[PDB]
Design a protein around this ligand. Structure first.
Ligand code: QI4
Ligand code: QI4
Ligand code: CL
Ligand code: CL
Ligand code: CL
Lengths: 301, 305
């Protein structure tokens, strides 16, 4: 019993964190095999932030301009290349702690663990979701660039995020491990704003199923709804539309608790209309949207 | 920016998790140097748990009754002994991944990271607080017994908790690493109930300081209060008393934000008597009490491990 926001154990990722210094900028790198991955903005100065030409800046760099430090050992950079917004520094030593890994690009609503680092040193691990507006609500300070987001698939680390920047609202933007940004963001100091965020409806439903599994039932009702009527209501509360894919994905939870998805959707509509009336669900006074259907099944079963 | 419930990096503890099997029971062990620590209830059957004589049950056991597995390697148990509610299995191999460590007993209100394990395999890490009623509101399934709670002090792991059982309300009970339970609990199948829980006041104040550091300041007011008047109000809402030690510990956050502790206490007092009025603090509609003052400073300044 119990329901917590739980991150994956970070050990496999800690053994990959290194410090990358270029000129006056110091950030984090991910050392996998003989390659260190990090945000390409590490090569940027004061003049090259508003409109940097990264290809031109990288051509002017030599391997000796990059200082890579793994613990107390300095790694020798023997090559450099760029893949989208990620810089790849080829090193002379393969990381002996390299776990079984994959690079995966995730979709909005998906969750992952974040290993927040400073100067190549892990300081904390927390749990995030990719927001529908493609930002993440992380907890990061200056120097956290290059910190990674990941999930663990048995004994395999799927790297899905690398932190690049903090937007003016305090939310965070970054890329997958192939350097492609999540969202309409660029690694330039140009005026950028996240779109209006919405609630991940499928995750709220998954979390309501977690609450039922844990013995919470006060919010249940005798109503059901059509998918379209549910979406018309949910949208008025800035909730993401619930697709047939989401209904199917909630199927196992629906079978386990005996409550149909559209039946649970009618409970959610009621909660949006009434609020919680001083009650909590799994110790929370707000509806939680950072647990996917897969997270709820893994944590409850 | 941002404020998350953040656990310590778990790597130093993952390298210590092993699987301990005795008869039909399989749970987790903590392998440090040449000793594996685990709950002594691993030696129990169904009848044994009801009314156990652990000294008598352990005397009947041999080293070969314990099956310890570290990854894919079976460790050889060369000794067994009991310290309070923890069983210590001496093994023939010292754990090469043993970090610098300490065994520490924590106080209620103190927070720690839990590495939830099943079959000696770490599956999740989460941050939680030792409640004033000595339970932890954890997330554990069958097989999680032996999972440990810890903090990281520079590069030294301080082990403070080992999971033993789940109470009928779904909350959790366990011991320090010397086998002494936190709270009035016993490792026997008998009727046990956690006392009425209270809110960790010093932690709520630390979290209000974290919200101010993040720019969320609607709850601040012009007022201050006495520690005496605040505690009278706190007792009424099932809040723990705030001591002069707590006021001193909140000092650096008070200096950083420009909000004296008794000034923040007057904000907390109004929040209790009037509610949030539809507003949230750090995206929460409830007052959060699982971040200590040290946790808020560590996160809002970026201390590494
Ligand atoms: C390096 C910096 C950045 O946003 N860093 C941070 C990352 N995360 C949190 C921070 C909190 C406070 C201050 C800086 C934080 C930055 C600035 C502009 C651009 Cl376009 C890019 Cl790619 C990167
Ligand atoms: C081994 C079991 C126990 O509490 N198990 C669990 C421990 N943690 C979570 C659980 C979730 C679901 C089911 C069982 C969970 C137990 C029973 C009674 C006593 Cl007195 C003791 Cl010491 C131990
Ligand atoms: Cl599923
Ligand atoms: Cl809440
Ligand atoms: Cl402090």
């Amino acid at each position: 019993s119990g329901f917590r926001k739980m991150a994956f154990p970070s050990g496999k990722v800690e053994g990959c964190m290194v410090q990358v210094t270029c000129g006056t900028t110091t950030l984090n790198g991910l050392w996998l095999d003989d390659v260190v991955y990090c945000p390409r903005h590490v090569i940027c100065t004061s003049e090259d932030m508003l409109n940097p030409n990264y290809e031109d800046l990288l051509i002017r760099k030599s391997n000796h301009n990059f200082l890579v430090q793994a613990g107390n050992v300095q790694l020798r950079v023997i090559g450099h290349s760029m893949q989208n917004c990620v810089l790849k520094l080829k090193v002379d030593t393969a990381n002996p702690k390299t776990p079984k890994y994959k690079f995966v690009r995730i979709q909005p609503g998906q969750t992952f663990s974040v290993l927040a680092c400073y100067n190549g040193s892990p300081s904390g691990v927390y749990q995030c979701a990719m927001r529908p507006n493609f930002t993440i609500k992380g907890s990061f300070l200056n120097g956290s660039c290059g910190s990674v987001g990941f999930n663990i698939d048995y004994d395999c680390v799927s790297f899905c995020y690398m932190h690049h920047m903090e937007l003016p609202t305090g939310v965070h933007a970054g890329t997958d491990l192939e350097g492609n940004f999540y969202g309409p963001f660029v690694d330039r100091q140009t005026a950028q704003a996240a779109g209006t965020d919405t609630t991940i409806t499928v995750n709220v439903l998954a979390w309501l199923y977690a609450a039922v599994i844990n013995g919470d039932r006060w919010f249940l009702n005798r109503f059901t709804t059509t998918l379209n009527d549910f979406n018309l209501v949910a949208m008025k509360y800035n909730y993401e539309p619930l697709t047939q894919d989401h209904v199917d994905i909630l199927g196992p939870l629906s079978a386990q608790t005996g409550i149909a998805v559209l039946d649970m959707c009618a409970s959610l509509k009621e909660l949006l209309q009434n609020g919680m009336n001083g009650r909590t669900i799994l110790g929370s006074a707000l509806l939680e949207d950072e647990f996917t259907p897969f997270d709820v099944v893994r944590q409850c079963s």
